[PDB]
Amino acid sequence: GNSVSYDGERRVNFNENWRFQRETNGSIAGAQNPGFDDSSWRKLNLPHDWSIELDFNKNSLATHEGGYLDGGIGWYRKTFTIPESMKGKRISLDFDGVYMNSTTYLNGEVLGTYPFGYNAFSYDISDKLYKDGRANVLVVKVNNTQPSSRWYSGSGIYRNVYLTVTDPIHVARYGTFVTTPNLEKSIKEDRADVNIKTKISNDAAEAKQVKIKSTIYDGAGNTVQTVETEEKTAAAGTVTPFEQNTVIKQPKLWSIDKPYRYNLVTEVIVGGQTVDTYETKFGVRYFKFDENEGFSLNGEYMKLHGVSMHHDLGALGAATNARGVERQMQIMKDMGVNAIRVTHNPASPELLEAANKLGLFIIEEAFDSWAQSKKPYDYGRFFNAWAEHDIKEMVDRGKNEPAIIMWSIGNEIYDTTNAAGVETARNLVGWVKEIDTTRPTTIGEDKTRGDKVNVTPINSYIKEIFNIVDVVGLNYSENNYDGYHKQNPSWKLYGSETSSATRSRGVYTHPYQYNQSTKYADLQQSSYDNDYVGWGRTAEDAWKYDRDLKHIAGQFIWTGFDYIGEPTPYYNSYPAKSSYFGAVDTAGFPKDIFYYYQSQWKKEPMVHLLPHWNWKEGEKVRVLAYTNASKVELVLNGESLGEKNYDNKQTSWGAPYKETKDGKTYLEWAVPFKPGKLEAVAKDENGKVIARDQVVTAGEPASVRLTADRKVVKADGTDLSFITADIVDSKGIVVPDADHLITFNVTGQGELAGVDNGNASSVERYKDNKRKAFSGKALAIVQSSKLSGKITVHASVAGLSSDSTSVFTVTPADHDKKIVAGIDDVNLTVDVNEAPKLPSEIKVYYSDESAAAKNVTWDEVDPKQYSTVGEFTVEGSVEGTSLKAKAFVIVKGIVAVKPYSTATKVGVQPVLPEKATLLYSDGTTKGATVTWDEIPEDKLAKEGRFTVEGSVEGTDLKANVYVRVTNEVKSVNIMLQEQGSAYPKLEATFTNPADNLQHLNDGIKSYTNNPVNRWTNWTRTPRDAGDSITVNFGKKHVINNLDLFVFTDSGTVVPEKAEVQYWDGTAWKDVENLTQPSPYVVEKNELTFDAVATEKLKFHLTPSVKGKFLALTEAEVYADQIVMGETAKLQSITVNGKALEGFDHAKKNYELVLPYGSELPKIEAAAADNATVTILPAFSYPGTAKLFVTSEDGKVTTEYSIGVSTEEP
């Protein structure tokens, strides 16, 4: 417990060296008081969401709404001492957020409790601390009992915690409310009237004479206007308010395209000396919601192009981070967004700061539910006692923000149709108006949706509430946008939520069918914009509804950014864990609808040709072009494919917009696919080109290239850098369907904060060093530490080339000065006897996140370096500074023949890859075409092993492969017809005579009124034990599935499960790859068990309902075969043809130390009866080679490792 670092700053950070322990074996007692022994607990930096670190639990009580991530009860502790500089002055402990039902103790005594989860709270700490210099013990209990939210919320102290140190006479917690009343009339005279109301708290023992000097500082730091009030008495232990009026000449208005802000420094002066200073940043802006003309900031009309964000930050969970929030706000700004509607909870301070800096409006929303709770442990349980406090808290914190434009009171609240609902809405609006009368109140109501076609007749109480609030928001109720305006001309309307469409990144299924709330077998959603929820609409529908009406202030499309939890279409699928709504996935990679909204809402020209170009030959593919230009023509491999265009239309009041004759806002073709390059050139009205975009067919995966958004970051310990790892083709084209496992290694002055790929149906933990790519991309987040320097990230995919990227970390002081931070390294890969190339200029990065190419002088490269296979470094010098450049060259290629092996059946050639992997003795894994020798059927028939020769095209050497044989030959088809046989004679444990078992393979299903053909074990007595069906074949062929068609009636019910077993002539065994879908009634089914020796296949059934019987109509099995054999474990292992010293079956690794500089050794291995063995000879000086063995048909396996090494030089 190190003492708090205090340097006179008013607010002291408090995130350092906390402790944590989550309850797992019941309540842990004694954790409240200082006497607890917490030396065994884990240490962590405070902004911390403990739920994201846990792995996904299928049985979590937060089922499919919290994302299957557990919360629970967690304990925090911190031991600290207060320096002697802080003695004798007021100290308060400020939390920006603890998720729910928090109870904080200090020195063993209860300090308070704050049920709400998204609001800051504070406690007065000065009296409780120990002034003896001994150690204090702050303890925070967090009780996030599970079913407490409709979306992933996180758990624990997920926002910053501060200490506020101030003189006994100080500005109050939020004791400053600077406003600019009547700005619209004033600005015409080029003058803003500023009114400042500051509240001074006097916690001293006696009244004192208090004076205030308030000065307005410009954006650049030069004084604008300073005013000093008149001294007035300040009674002890009370808040005494002041008030001042000033002016600003030629004020710089805060605006979306120019977010200027001022800075007010309030100095409290007692006895002719400053005693306390307070800083609040405000802005000079005025907005209006007109019932006919819509929203308008200052004098300019504009639409509220908005998105409905959540607080979850994706890979790093609910834990707040300034850079991550700013990054997602920058992406949303890049989409053309004007406003953010913080969904169903107040905003974090970082979000408001990012909105104020970037220039985005904000709509703060206080509650998701009033006293009528939506989940058992939701906040409605606490609403009656804490609603006033929480709404006042939100309005007080946010009153000074220029970004905020409205206060929302609720969203889809079930008791809004009752008299108590009107009463509590009136209460809430009154409480909001008690602090901030300069912004309208708002409510989000969905019950007006009705049939979604005609103007719903509004409920009486809903009308009352709509009359109480200043602005009315309509969720998914586009059918009332103009009806309610006509019926109620005084209402100001906007779309609080619209177009709840679903979409996965890079998924293009069902191109021409528009579905509603449909699940799919792959647990994905179509990115063609043909998928949306039942109550929602396609993005185009909502945008067209909003665009046509002047009086609609705008809309806020749903979810903006994907978030964890609420995979609506998949209401109970387990792998489905994250939303599909967002226009940008969880990792921050835009989907196609991102570019649709870019075309619709932005002004500058562009074009996006969405579907990737990796399809099968000759199949027509629907290609769309989300563009705002008036013309587009496709040029497939140089041949123009035709030109499509818009019509320059206009709305009723004269707002230009572009649309086709059909009424579609996007251009569309239907092209037959052929590999190559597909290019779209966007041409304006006169034909001038104004934008371009292309999609080119990708090749086989080649490497893993890393891109870093910000190459220079601060060394403040929290600045993040986001690294885009995407599998690429040899030409540098992202493979559109790659899903390889990327392994990240981060070393230097930083650490891996998290990884993600944006997949909504993956249960890969976010806090790990590896992540599967999804649609050819994956994300890695690295956060800097307190030490300046460099962060080096290394990514590697098995069978692919690696890549390394550098992130330079500089001190905060240097970030404001233009000095060199570092020079990026160069990575090159060449073949043997290939001279590597060195660029004439390379990029040098300064401390101000800027800078570009600079001249360099490279040192000589000798022929010896690249004339042989190996790895070496090349160094140079840049002309700008003394720092040494560096280039890494990898020289690898044809060294030795590559080994391969396979197994197959008798008379069937093995499944040999038509693209051989050229894994020479260097570590490189290039791929190339191979023409295998025609394997005679005579050799396949003969038992044993044989070698085959593979002719690789364009290589200096030829490949080889080994083979194994089994059973008998077969054709591709399953079966045409059986003339007659004893095989189809089925058997079962029990079969009613009237329900002959043979019907299950007769082929005629009897779902409908057609003649009954079924098996049924019906009896007069219960048969809850179950029954099994048996089939037999004499074949020697492949199997891939087990079909099940079920029969049901008053007596017979569907099986609870279908366990499948196989008979090999000796005993029964379990099959692999069952994959039994979920239960059903009168529906078809299939189990996907893999090919297995199935002399007899028997699967057992049990009733789904006790006291009810079992029945079936058809079950399909096809073939049979025999196992390879009872092969034993490894037999021999040798290195360089010599026995490996230290080898032992009871040792994990075998170490060999050759003389320094010796050639890498070669490895050979074998197993009993030629059991399959994976052989990987060593290729690199460091590391250790590994081998694996496969035997028999069960779990028998073993790993053999050979630690090649050498002695000292």
Question: By the 8 A CB rule, do 573 and 557 touch?
Answer: no
3-state secondary structure 1040-1051: CCEEEEECCCCC
Q: How far is Cα 299 from Cα 111, in angstroms, rounded to an integer?
A: 49
Q: How far is Cα 935 from Cα 957, in angstroms, rounded to an integer?
A: 20
Which residue has 């004759």 as its token pair? Answer: 661
Q: What is each CA distance from 952 to 535, 703, 931, in whole angstroms?
A: 58, 22, 6
Q: How far apart are the first and last CA of the chain?
A: 47
Q: Which string of b and e fits 367-396 if b means at least 16 CB within 10 Å?
A: bbbbbbbbbebbbbbbbeebbeebbbbbbb
Q: Output phi, psi for 931, to 5 deg.
A: -115, 105
Q: Is the dihedral of CA 220, 225, 231, 236 positive or negative?
A: negative
Instruction: Give the 3-state secondary structure of residue 50.
Output: helix
Identity of the amino acid at 523: L
Q: Is the dihedral of CA 1142, 1143, 1144, 1147 positive or negative?
A: positive
Question: By the 8 A CB rule, do 794 and 827 touch?
Answer: no
Of 638, 501, 647, nearest in space to 580 by CA: 501
Task: Please state the separation of Cα 691 from the chain's center in Å.
Answer: 30
Instruction: Indicate the burial class of 190 (C-beta count within 10 angstroms; 0-12, 13-18, 19 or more).
Output: exposed
Report the run of H or E that residue 891 belongs to, with start and end.
strand 884-891
Data resolution in angstroms: 3.2
Catalytic residues: 412, 497
Identity of the amino acid at 202: N
Q: What is each CA distance from 955 to 22, 30, 701, in whole angstroms?
A: 59, 72, 20
Question: By the 8 A CB rule, do 1106 and 1028 touch?
Answer: no
942 Cβ contact list (under 8 Å, min separation 6)? 965
Q: Is the dihedral of CA 457, 461, 463, 465 positive or negative?
A: negative
The 10 Å Cβ neighbour count of residue 23 is: 14
Domains of the chain: 11-166 (2.60.120.260), 181-280 (2.60.40.10), 287-500+535-580 (3.20.20.80), 604-611+613-696 (2.60.40.10), 698-816 (2.60.40.10), 822-892 (2.60.40), 987-1116 (2.60.120.260), 1125-1209 (2.60.40)
Q: How far is Cα 1113 from Cα 995, in angstroms, rounded to an integer?
A: 10
DSSP secondary structure of 594-618: HHHHHHHH--S--EEE-S-S---TT
Of 1076, 1049, 1038, nearest in space to 994 by CA: 1049
Q: How far is Cα 573 from Cα 567, in angstroms, rounded to an integer?
A: 9
Which residue has 């790659």 as its token pair? Answer: 738
Report the run of H or E that residue 14 belongs to, with start and end.
none
Instruction: Indicate the burial class of 714 (C-beta count within 10 angstroms; 0-12, 13-18, 19 or more).
Output: buried
Q: How far is Cα 208 from Cα 205, in angstroms, rounded to an integer?
A: 9
Question: By the 8 A CB rule, do 1126 and 1044 touch?
Answer: no
Q: Residue 65 is encoded by which pair of tokens?
A: 């709404």
Q: Is the dihedral of CA 127, 129, 130, 131 positive or negative?
A: negative
The 10 Å Cβ neighbour count of residue 977 is: 4
Instruction: Indicate the burial class of 665 (C-beta count within 10 angstroms; 0-12, 13-18, 19 or more).
Output: buried
Q: Residue 393 is encoded by which pair of tokens?
A: 């808290």
Q: How far is Cα 76 from Cα 50, in angstroms, rounded to an integer?
A: 11
Q: Output phi, psi for 1103, to 5 deg.
A: -65, 145
Task: Please state the separation of Cα 252 from the chain's center in Å.
Answer: 38
Q: How far is Cα 725 from Cα 773, in angstroms, rounded to an integer?
A: 8
Question: How many alpha carbons fall within 13 Å on the CB side of residue 326?
Answer: 15
Question: By the 8 A CB rule, do 22 and 73 touch?
Answer: yes
DSSP secondary structure of 90-125: EEEEEES---SSEEEEETTEEEEEE--SSS-EEEE-
The 10 Å Cβ neighbour count of residue 1068 is: 11
Q: Backbone dihedral region of 849: left (phi > 0), alpha (psi from -120 to 50 degrees) or beta?
A: left
Identity of the amino acid at 934: E
Question: By the 8 A CB rule, do 236 and 201 touch?
Answer: no
DSSP secondary structure of 577-600: -B-S--SB-TTS-B-HHHHHHHHH
Of 244, 252, 250, nearest in space to 227 by CA: 244
Instruction: Give the 3-state secondary structure of residue 183.
Output: helix
Q: How far is Cα 401 from Cα 342, in angstroms, rounded to an integer?
A: 14
Of 1094, 963, 972, nearest in space to 1035 by CA: 1094
Q: Residue 811 is encoded by which pair of tokens?
A: 């001190």
3-state secondary structure 804-850: EEEEEEECCCHHHCCCEEEECCEEEEECCCCCCCCCCEEEEEECCCC
Strand residues in 403-527 grouped as ranges (E): 404-411, 441-445, 471-475, 493-498, 515-516
529 Cβ contact list (under 8 Å, min separation 6)? 501, 503, 538, 539, 540, 592, 593, 596
Helix count and strand count (H, E) for the chain: 12, 77
The DSSP bridge partners found for residue 106 are 109, 138
Instruction: Give the 3-state secondary structure of residue 445.
Output: strand
Of 503, 501, 482, 502, nearest in space to 493 by CA: 482
Which residue has 């709270």 as its token pair? Answer: 121
Question: By the 8 A CB rule, do 563 and 65 touch?
Answer: no
Q: What is each CA distance from 688 to 11, 605, 680, 692, in whole angstroms?
A: 57, 12, 14, 12
Residue 52: DSSP 8-state: H
Question: By the 8 A CB rule, do 957 and 894 touch?
Answer: yes
Q: Output phi, psi for 761, to 5 deg.
A: -110, 20
Of 901, 902, 904, nearest in space to 1091 by CA: 904
Q: Residue 142 is encoded by which pair of tokens?
A: 């967090």
The 10 Å Cβ neighbour count of residue 832 is: 16
Question: By the 8 A CB rule, do 476 and 537 touch?
Answer: yes
Q: How far is Cα 910 from Cα 464, in angstroms, rounded to an integer?
A: 76
Q: How far is Cα 824 from Cα 841, in angstroms, rounded to an integer?
A: 11
1027 Cβ contact list (under 8 Å, min separation 6)? 988, 989, 990, 1017, 1100, 1101, 1110
Residues shown for the chain: 1209
Question: By the 8 A CB rule, do 270 and 169 touch?
Answer: yes
Q: How far is Cα 540 from Cα 516, in angstroms, rounded to an integer?
A: 15
Q: Output phi, psi for 701, to 5 deg.
A: -60, 135
636 Cβ contact list (under 8 Å, min separation 6)? 671, 674, 676, 677, 678, 679
Question: By the 8 A CB rule, do 236 and 207 touch?
Answer: yes
Of 563, 570, 481, 477, nearest in space to 518 by CA: 570
The DSSP bridge partners found for residue 831 are none
Q: Output phi, psi for 351, to 5 deg.
A: -65, -45
Which residue has 């504009």 as its token pair? Answer: 302
Q: How far is Cα 1166 from Cα 1173, in angstroms, rounded to an integer?
A: 7
Question: How many alpha carbons fall within 13 Å on the CB side of residue 1124?
Answer: 22
Question: By the 8 A CB rule, do 608 and 626 touch?
Answer: yes
Give the technique used to solve this structure. Answer: cryo-EM
Question: By the 8 A CB rule, do 742 and 704 touch?
Answer: yes
Instruction: Give the 3-state secondary structure of residue 856.
Output: strand
Q: What is each CA distance from 886 to 708, 852, 981, in whole angstroms?
A: 19, 17, 75
